[PDB]
Amino acid sequence: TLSILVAHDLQRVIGFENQLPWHLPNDLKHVKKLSTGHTLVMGRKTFESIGKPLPNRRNVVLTSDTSFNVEGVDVIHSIEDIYQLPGHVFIFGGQTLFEEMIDKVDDMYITVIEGKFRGDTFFPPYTFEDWEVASSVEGKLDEKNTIPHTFLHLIRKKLVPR
Ligand SMILES: NC(=O)c1ccc[n+]([C@@H]2O[C@H](COP(=O)([O-])OP(=O)(O)OC[C@H]3O[C@@H](n4cnc5c(N)ncnc54)[C@H](OP(=O)(O)O)[C@@H]3O)[C@@H](O)[C@H]2O)c1
Ligand SMILES: COc1cc(Cc2cnc(N)nc2N)cc(/C=C/C(=O)N2N=Cc3ccccc3[C@@H]2c2ccc(C)cc2)c1OC
């Protein structure tokens, strides 16, 4: 399986100055539970922002840098390399990788952050006409998670004769 994994706000902002614009622990827990035991594919900037590999999953970084080498990280240099990765692969970010892959993935795990943040990087536009809502689950709010958010699992609709 090839999936997108992303959090975007009401205007599809995903980032600001190489950071997440929001503080939302529950979304990072969501990410953890979905991706443990599987594979994350991320662009170089997204990796440098996180700074280290995330434990208990395969960490794959796409970069043109032939000198790139980080302990605990596998490196690829082409989009085509993604299709040779075994198992359930999650496209993890950032904007560049989402743009390159949104037309190629089977499904998307999207956290909709129900707010409007300042951003400098965006998830590409998409329409629910093309995507079936396999599930939509409201995140629970509390002391440490104060921004309303919704977990969407979207599956690409098949084109059929009407
Ligand atoms: N909200 C979310 O869910 C989420 C998730 C992830 C990231 N983010 C945010 O997204 C932002 C970063 O996105 P970004 O687009 O600026 O950077 P990015 O996609 O994280 O990484 C860009 C880099 O990926 C490498 N790359 C991409 N496509 C390639 C290809 N076809 N071949 C070879 N290398 C390729 C290049 O690395 P080299 O330049 O080294 O060649 C490129 O400069 C950050 O603000 C981050 O916080 C948000
Ligand atoms: C640009 O910065 C980032 C971008 C993304 C991508 C992303 C985020 N959200 C959604 N919905 N999709 C995505 N593709 C993740 C992160 C976060 C990574 C990150 O520390 N943990 N994660 C998974 C994980 C697994 C095992 C141990 C620890 C972690 C860690 C983490 C987990 C839970 C809490 C409460 C706190 C921290 C990130 O750094 C802030």
* Domains of the chain and any CATH numbers: 1-162 (3.40.430.10)
Ligand 1 proximal residues by C-beta, below 6 Å: 6-7, 14-15, 18-20, 43-46, 49, 62-65, 77-79, 92-97, 100, 121
Q: CA angle, 20 as apex, 146 and 143 as ends, to 5°?
A: 15
Whole-number Å distance, alpha carbon 159 to ligand 2 midpoint, is 34
| Cross-strand pairs, 8 | 112
Nearest ligand 1 atom to the CA of 19 is: 47
- Determined by X-ray
70 touches ligand 2 (CB under 6 Å): no
Give residue for tokens 């205007």: 11
b/e for 76-112, b at 16 or more Cβ within 10 A?
Answer: beeeeebeebeeebbbbbbbebbeebbeebebbbbbb
In sequence order, which residues have a C-beta less than 8 Å from that of residue 137 and are 6 or more positions away?
150, 151
Q: Which residues pair with 20 in a beta bridge?
A: none
Close Cβ partners of 134 (under 8 Å, ≥ 6 residues apart): 107, 153, 154, 155
Mutate to test the pocket of ligand 2, among 14, 17, 30, 31 (most ligand atoms within 8 A of CB): 31
Tell whether 66 is in a known binding site: no
Say which residues have a Cβ less than 8 Å from residue 153's Cβ, sequence separation at least 6.
Answer: 107, 108, 109, 110, 133, 134, 135, 136
Chain breaks in the chain (C to N over 2.5 A) after: none
Taking the CA of 65 as reference, the closest ligand is 1
Q: Which residues pair with 112 in a beta bridge?
A: 8, 150
Taking the mean position of all CA atoms in its chain, how far away is CA 10? 16
Assign residue 30 a region (left: φ > 0; alpha: ψ between -120 and 50; beta: otherwise): alpha
| 19 DSSP 8-state letter | B
117: left (phi over 0), alpha (psi -120 to 50) or beta: beta
Among residues 14, 25, 6, the alpha carbon closest in space to that of 117 is found at 14
Task: Report which bound ligand comes closest to the CA of 33.
Answer: 2
- What Cα–Cα distance (Å) separates residue 138 from each residue in 3, 78, 114, 135, 151? 20, 36, 10, 10, 6
From CA 39, how far away is CA 58, in angstroms rounded?
Answer: 5
Which residue is closest in CA terms to ligand 1's atom 30? 78
Alpha-carbon gap, residue 132 to 25, rounded angstroms? 27
Q: Are 13 and 118 in contact (CB under 8 A)?
A: yes
Whether 20 is in the pocket of ligand 2, judged by its Cβ within 6 Å, is yes
